[model samples]
Target chain A: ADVFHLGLTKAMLDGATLAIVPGDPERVKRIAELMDNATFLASHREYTSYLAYADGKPVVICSTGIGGPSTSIAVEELAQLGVNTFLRVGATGAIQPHVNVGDVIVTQASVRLDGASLHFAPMEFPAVANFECTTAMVAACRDAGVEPHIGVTASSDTFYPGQERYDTVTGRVTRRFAGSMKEWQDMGVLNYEMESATLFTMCATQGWRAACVAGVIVNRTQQEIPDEATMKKTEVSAVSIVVAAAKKLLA
Target chain B: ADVFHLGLTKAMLDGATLAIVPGDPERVKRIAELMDNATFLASHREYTSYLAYADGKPVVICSTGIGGPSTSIAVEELAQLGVNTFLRVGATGAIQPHVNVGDVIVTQASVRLDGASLHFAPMEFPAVANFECTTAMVAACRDAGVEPHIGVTASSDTFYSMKEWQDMGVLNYEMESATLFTMCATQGWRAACVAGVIVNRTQQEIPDEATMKKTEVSAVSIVVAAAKKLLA
Candidate 1:
């Protein structure tokens, strides 16, 4: 009953149906602190986990690192430990003109430009968020006095070139991805992130519920990147929205 | 200001925002008859079109032959003629065990095996229905006393085997929505698909012609109601 990558057993999940996943391991403790009866569970490699309760129901807070490879691993292993639903929370850079910095996006679907999901489903398969889960996040956002943007996010493998970010330290925007930002903007994709596509695709194939909520830290059309102070504040906003959504789901 | 394929000029559209697209040209008139003050608009190749009214507002009913290649033409030409929203109603074969024959599915997204969508966007860019448009179809289904199945559909150009897609939890197989959705999304127009389940290949053979037509009409009613809701 032990899952190798997450270092969690079926019993450790405590029959939890929901898991809120973050890409940065540091956010696990921060997310758990927002829950009741929080307890540190395990940390293995990039996967740091904690068990918490919301509305007197068990919820798992786990980190899946930064890309599809690690995120899919966490999804695969946590699913084995009885987590039937996943809510991925992270930061993203806006691609479309209307999406602004400090905004939240309830990802209704994602462009599966990542390599990890290809192992689970063919390239033709779409990465769609669970309708009920996405609805809950949207409602949670409104209750928090923030009108969230609901649309598609382009989930790429690399945060730099794949997202067509020109601000990389190495300053390399490869030819293939050089114009992707413009293309996604034309397609009305809201933002760019790294893991929701993998999470949604893998969960869809397994018949599990998956959704994502991301805070906009950078608006690439206006700013190449955001200040550290702005990013820290946006991350908390994203985290708290996911917590509210989790409570809604548990209730 | 005439669109060549659909044979309609901007002045001819009467500023219609919602279009109900069916695959067969034969269905254009039939769908139009369901509307008020229906009138034959134009016929160009496989794209036969009609103009009608819902809630006293103009609505278009057009045909897109079969498959993605032809479907893309209808979408492009209609979009040129002031149509900003599309609701595609057609027949589909169910792949999932739970989906029954004669039920309707409001496709939320599609497995984009069709080649036509690639011209609009890359394969990785998902063929997603406009959220508000899909919600309208689901509401219309419930209002019609038909609780619909809302899920992903596998859309391929050819009628072929699809065990691979079925394993991935695709609910049905159809030929147009992938192309339709991709084009709409890329252009920032709203599009949705609702199809009558005429066959469950794993469970039953294709239904009789009359039975199939009846089921298709049932789906058409749902789309008709949804169009009114969206336009309202």
Candidate 2:
């Protein structure tokens, strides 16, 4: 079987009921460890998938690389392989003042700032997380004693420039970047990340359940970055919440 | 003058107080006929510019191809050449159920569905028509006994696609308002547009603005488009 077709066919044959997508390969390994009976399945590009039994139900995890374009490709390929439920677990920057660093942000909906999702659906089409998945994540967070901020998230393509940071030598901040963050903040977006729009759009288009639970590693409003220990703790808490939610749903 | 660069520079130098951009070259001729002192200055690919005086004020009309990408070029060049005020007098398909054929739509704001504008600003940026420009268009329609709908207009890039026809294809209207409004809004634009509703968005027959004026005209709506053309 060819790699392209094999990737798609193998996914379908595996009959993965749930998918745990991370942008970092290291995160995929961490998620695999949290599962009951986990085994490495494949590795290609930034995508590293693994199969596992969590609460006696089959599940899989795959990396989605960096932005919406790569994230969309992973979702499409996984959907072709019969994977339905998707959980995007990653890290984000808090936009709202109240959201603290290391807090979990469960995205309710996403602003379609992702350029790739625009190619598939109209701007008016809401990039909303699955209600069931959202409820599950919230419950799991409560059970794990982690406070989660459930609100809208702004998804962007470029990490530094798109998120409104000075990149050039002069380091002059542009109005467009500041205005985008300000507008999303005014619209009540809890945080900002790179992948929620892609996850929500794929779920909407494929009629599958999808949601994002991200560790807030940076507070864009306060201009603060979490310490290495805090970052690791947040990541562990996020993975715990997601795995617990998936397990409860599977049970 | 190179064809593309010349088109950009000529538009800049003309320095018309008001530029009426139509998509069709022949329609530029139709508009020229109505002006008291109109003279053709240049004609190129979907860009026919003319220097003219409408009611003793300096005015120019330039055709802006079909979509936002081309229309944005015309605007950028026109802006560079000291032409700040633009009035797009074209046709559109009405989305609201009450809006009829042959009516005019005075766009107050527009949905940013155009790709060209996105390069300059974020999607959250409001694409709003200049109040004065919008006012002028409505006044022109009212004085001419035409009824106009004043509301948000949607500007898109695709003529045929799922994105274009998303909401039963009911709200989609083709033109360059998104790009125009975003630029104007960001750069302190004194621009507006009055579009005649030639076809309903859903392709249904409705009342014409010219015919419905006998009963009464909404003053808020009438004043919005009227003030700009009068002042400009």
The DockQ leader among the candidates is: 2
Off by over 4 Å in 2: A1-8, A11-13, A167-175, A223-225, B1-232
TM-score, predicted candidate 2 vs. hidden true structure: 0.52
Top of the candidates by lDDT: 1
Query: Which 10-residue span in candidate 1 chain A carries the lowest summed lDDT?
Result: A165-174
Candidate 2, overall lDDT?
A: 0.67
Clashing pairs in 1: none
lDDT of 2 by residue, B1-232 (tens): 3233215454433446556666555566656546656787775434667766665665666776555545655665565556677776666667655566656677777777655566457778788888767766766776877766777777764332434444543343755777678766766556676666665555555656554442123222333234335535
| Every candidate's chain B TM-score | 0.96, 0.79
Cα lDDT tens digits for candidate 1, A1-251:
39855778888878888999997676799899999989899876557899999978999999876556557778888888889999999888888777878899999999976655765788788899999999999998999899999999998755445666544333445456778888989999999887788789889988999999999988878855677887888889999999999999889
Q: What is the TM-score of chain A alone in each candidate?
A: 0.95, 0.92
TM-score of structure candidate 1: 0.52
> Clashes in candidate 1: how many?
0
